[PDB]
Every structure is written in structure tokens, then in C-alpha cells.
Amino acid sequence: FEAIFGTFCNRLEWVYFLTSGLAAAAHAIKFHDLNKLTTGKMLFHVQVP
């Protein structure tokens, strides 16, 4: 006879965005209506000494 000793299944290494070093450079917000906005803008007012 030939013997099949066993079948092994791989184990996945799950990851998330908020649990990684690159996330510190980021800052994450949920909005639910992003399709409706056209462009987001800042606005800076600066005075020079």
C-alpha cells in the first residue's frame, strides 16, 4: 500500500491598516458621503513678522 500521512493547511498572518507603522503617518476618518463632495480644501492665513 501507499500511505497518506496527513494534509496540512496553511495559517494566514492577518494584518490591519491601523496596526502598522505606516498608520502613524496617516490619520483616518470615515465620512459615508464621499461620493457627493467634489474637492476638499484647507485654508491658511499667515502674517509675517
Place this chain on the structure above:
Amino acid sequence: FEAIFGTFCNRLEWVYFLTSGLAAAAHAIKFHDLNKLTTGKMLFHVQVP
């Protein structure tokens, strides 16, 4: 629509003569009547051994 987020005004930082290290090189005297005069003289008397 077009979304405008928070607007920022410059957080201008203050600086002073006294707080600077250059003030140690200086002696600072305030004198409310300085406008009237234009002459300031000091005199040195030395005898050499």
C-alpha cells in the same frame, strides 16, 4: 458640493531682547527722557606705574 475644512490663522511666536542670549552681552537701561539729549560721554583717568 465643495467642502471647506478648518481654517488656520498663524500662531505667531513672540521673542524679546531680554530673553535672548545676546542680552548677556548688553546692559539695558530705560530712560523716558532720551529724546531731548544728543551727547553721551564717559571719562577715564589712569596713572601708569
